Structures are given as C-alpha cells and as structure tokens.
Amino acid sequence: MFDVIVVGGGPTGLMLAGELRLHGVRVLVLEKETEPTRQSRAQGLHVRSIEVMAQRGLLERFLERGHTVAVGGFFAGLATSWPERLDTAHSYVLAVPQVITEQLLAEHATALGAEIRRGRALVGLRQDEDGVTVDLADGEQLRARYVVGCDGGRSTVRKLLGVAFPGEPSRVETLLGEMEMTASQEELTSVMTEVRKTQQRFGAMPLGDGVFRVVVPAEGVAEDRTASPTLDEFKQQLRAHAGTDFGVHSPRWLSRFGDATRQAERYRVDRVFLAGDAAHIHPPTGGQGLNLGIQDAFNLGWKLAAEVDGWAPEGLLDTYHAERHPVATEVLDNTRAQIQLMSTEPGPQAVRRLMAELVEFENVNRYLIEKITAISVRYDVGEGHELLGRRMRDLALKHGRLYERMHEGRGLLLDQTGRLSVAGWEDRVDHVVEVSEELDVPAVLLRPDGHVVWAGEDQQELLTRMPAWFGAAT
C-alpha cells in the first residue's frame, strides 16, 4: 500500500509528487498516457511559480532550458510596459514549454524516490475510514491513505465523487496550431501588428523550431469537443480575420479550445482531494492555468505530508479548499474579463479603449501584473500584522538569498534579533538568524510555502501562532 496516490502526470501532480517526498511519503503517480504528449500546451511560468521553483532549488534547471521575458501585454493583450515596482526579486516571465516543465518536474520527483507508473488509468475508486481503494482499467486495485486528483479538466476522480463543475459554458471558440506558412518573415510581422488593433486574440509566435505558433479565432461553437480543425478550416479563419491564409505548408498539430470557466465545488471529500485543471478549468488568457495548478500542489503537499506524519493541526487539510478555491474564482473571473475585453462588439471595445487609458497609470499596470502572476495572493490566516497571509519574497540576507534555506520544505522562522527560538518544534520548523535590509519587521514566521502566519518580535506572542500551523510541541 501507499501513503498518497496522485492521479495524473501533468505539472500539477508531479509538483505535488515531489512536495510530498521532501517529508518522506510513499507516493504513487498514476498517469494514463503512456507517452507524454509533445503538444506544447502552455508556454511558461509566471512570477509566483518562478518564486516557487526557487524555494525548492529547481530554478537553475528551468532557466537553462527557457529564457526570460520582461514585456507588457498579458492582461487582454493590452500591450504596455513591464512595471518597475513589482514587490518581488523575480520580476520576469519565464518561457518554458510545458513539455520541458513536465520533464523537469518528473525527473526531479523521480529522483526524490516517487513511483510513477504510466499507462495506468483510474477507472473507479471508493474510500472507507482507513484509506482509499482505486480500481484501474487493467484490474489492479490499490490502497492509500489519501488520493489526490490531478487529472485535467475532464477529471475522472472529480466525476467519481459527484463534485459538481459549475460555471459558464464555452461560448468563444478559438483555433491554435504550430505550422509553417508560405510568407516572408516581414509579411507576418506587418500584418499581425496591423490587424491586431481590431482582433486581439490573433497572432503568431516563432519558437525557433523554424515553424510558428499561430492562434486565430473560430466561428460558432464546436459540438464534438474532440474534432481537430482541418487545415482548410484553419486557413478560412486566417482569411476571414486577416485576409491571407499565409499558405500553411504543414501543421505539426492543430487544436481547438474554448472559453469555458468551470470550477469544482469542493476541493476535498474526506481522503480524496482535487488539484489543477481537475478542480478548475478556464481560458488560457493570462497564462495562469499551469501556474494555478503548480501552486495548488504547492499549497497541499506540505499539508498532506503534515497529516501522514501525524503532526498536522486539526483543520489544516480543510484550509486547502478554504485557501485555493477563492484563488481559482478570481482567476476564472479575470479570464472572463480578459476575454470580454477582446470581444469585437462596440461595447467591449469601448471598455477596452477605457482600460487602455487606465493601464497607462503605473499603479494600475502594477495592479494587474500582480494579479496575473498571483504574487499578491493572500490567505486569511488570522488578525495581526500587515504581512500575514501574503508570501515572503526572496529576501537578500547577510549570507545568500532567502529562497536558499527553504529547499527541504520545512517551516522557516526568519529572525533578525537572536532572542527568538522554537522549543518543541525543532523537528518541523527551522531557525534562520540573518540580517536583511528589506525586512522592516524584526521576525517573520513562514509556512513551507512562504506565506506568513506571524510577523513581530515577542516570543510569548510567537508561542501562540506556532502551534496553529505547525502542531503541538514535543
């Protein structure tokens, strides 16, 4: 038997898979696809995920196989400027194909001692009070204390629990594909930049592979939800929205995605959880899809490992739903807003012209970039300091950076005084004493995910909030 079984080998499960191994947890990653899809779906990590990959040391290998981007135009394609006061030390956008992201997270989680069987497909599941049982299409039953569903929008775990997927259906179809075109490099760059003024969900991305990532709107609503668009369909759209089919020489793949904004009603059913697209689907606008799943897994693994190790507080697991569900709503909302700001109708365009006036304000631009990147995500932890709930940025200390002490996923107590000490939580929380000109407060208590639950200077006050998130002393 296992401690935790995850269902899904995407970036969400493999992040959860490694976040458990840090604490020694028997994890099994069940993945249906035998060969990982080369269909580059996403295109990179935003600021918070980059922060996340640094708190665990995986950032060096992400920058080797991607490149940084510091340009504006993420909110509804309102081309702007990258802000200059982002409250972070990783003020850029990383451009890594999801295939490489899946690869590095798997190679890391594998190297952390995590079974990942591919070709296994969960067909049924049921749970008692002592664990959860899992039936596969081949016939193997599996036992685990906790099962988490990280298996995409059409999640099988979600449907086997009765968790509803309420929201708005897909009403704006859009076509996408990686293909060559019979046109001069200048020919694309002069037409795209020209027509974009009216249609804002249209453009071309060369990724070096000689071929181009081209997205073009679609007419109507596809009923099949599984019918690949013919090249002729793809060509007619380019002509109807840009005037020239560009002559596609050949497609490597053609996809058709919608704008459905659904979100699971419950993130937890006793011993079964949901994370990633399995708990929330939404339009790709803003690049928050993959970043949302990584940070859901980054919210749960240390809580799930806190329970299997038998030191988690009472309602720790219940907060996974109570902290990550409001994030998906707000993200599902602005995607609804960004899609609206791209509508061709006279109304939406008028509101687009209005936002175009507002993003000229430095604080307004900073406010939206802080929202797409989710660096201003704040949990309700408890009354107190202005820092409670928010994540701590990479503070430059006397010796080294802050995100260098957080690799082993342990709770951190950054002290500037030397008169603090945890007694009875050494087994879970570390004690880092270092100076930082960036932290006006004397001390900060960080959860394994960087979110502050206490910031101050009194120890008797610290002795209150230590057990509420780290358990009773030894």
Ligand X SMILES: Cc1cc2nc3c(=O)[nH]c(=O)nc-3n(C[C@H](O)[C@H](O)[C@H](O)COP(=O)(O)OP(=O)(O)OC[C@H]3O[C@@H](n4cnc5c(N)ncnc54)[C@H](O)[C@@H]3O)c2cc1C
Ligand Y SMILES: CO[C@H]1/C=C/O[C@@]2(C)Oc3c(C)c(O)c4c(O)c(c(/C=N/N5CCN(C)CC5)c(O)c4c3C2=O)NC(=O)/C(C)=C\C=C\[C@H](C)[C@H](O)[C@@H](C)[C@@H](O)[C@@H](C)[C@H](OC(C)=O)[C@@H]1C
For residue 277, what is the DSSP state? Answer: G
Q: Does 93 bind ligand Y (CB under 6 A)?
A: yes
Q: Does 5 bind ligand X (CB under 6 A)?
A: no
Q: Which residues contact 322 (CB under 8 A, 6 or more apart)?
A: none
Q: For 12-51, give the DSSP string.
A: HHHHHHHHHHTT---EEEEES-SS---------B-HHHHH
CB of 52 to ligand X, least distance (A): 13
Q: How many CB atoms within 10 Å of residue 282?
A: 26
> What binding mask, one character per residue, do residues 415-454 give for ligand Y by CB under 6 A, x or -?
----------------------------------------
> What binding mask, one character per residue, do residues 330-369 give for Cl ion by CB under 5 A, x or -?
---------------------------x--x---------
In this structure, what token pair is assigned to residue 454? 């206490």
Q: Rounded to a whole number, what is the distance in angstroms from the first to the last CA of the chain? A: 29
Q: Does 284 bind ligand Y (CB under 6 A)?
A: yes
CB of 11 to ligand X, least distance (A): 5
Q: How many CA atoms lie within 13 A of 129 on its CB side?
A: 0
Selected range binding ligand X among 124-132, 283-291, 326-334, 359-367, rule: CB under 6 A = 283-291
> What binding mask, one character per residue, do residues 19-58 give for ligand Y by CB under 6 A, x or -?
------------------------xx-x------------
By CB under 6 A, name the one of 127, 237, 263, 285 that touches ligand Y: 285
Query: Which residue number places its CB atom closest to ligand Y?
Result: 287
The item of Cl ion, ligand Y, ligand X, none sharing an interface with residue 165, based on CB under 5 to 8 Å by kind, is: Cl ion
Cβ–Cβ < 8 Å for 261, 135: no
Cβ–Cβ < 8 Å for 259, 340: no
Residues that constitute the known binding site for FAD? 12, 31-32, 98, 122, 156, 277, 290-291
Comparison of 153 and 442: residue with beta carbon closer to ligand Y: 153
Q: For 112-124, give the DSSP string.
A: TT-EEEES--EEE
Q: What is the dihedral of CA 425, 322, 290, 143, to 10 degrees?
A: 70
By CB under 6 A, name the one of 121, 364, 463, 468 that touches ligand X: 121
Phi then psi for 6, rounded to 5 degrees?
Answer: -105, 145
> What binding mask, one character per residue, do residues 194-233 give for ligand Y by CB under 6 A, x or -?
-------x-x-x---------x------------------
By CB under 6 A, name the one of 66, 97, 284, 411 that touches ligand X: 284
Cβ–Cβ < 8 Å for 234, 177: yes
Q: Does 373 bind ligand Y (CB under 6 A)?
A: no
Residues in the chain: 474
CB of 154 to ligand Y, least distance (A): 19
Cβ–Cβ < 8 Å for 295, 304: no
Q: How many CB atoms within 10 Å of residue 362?
A: 12
The item of ligand Y, Cl ion, ligand X, none sharing an interface with residue 360, based on CB under 5 to 8 Å by kind, is: Cl ion
Positions in the binding site for ligand Y (CB under 6 A): 43-44, 46, 69, 71, 73-74, 77, 93, 95, 174, 176, 201, 203, 205, 215, 284-287
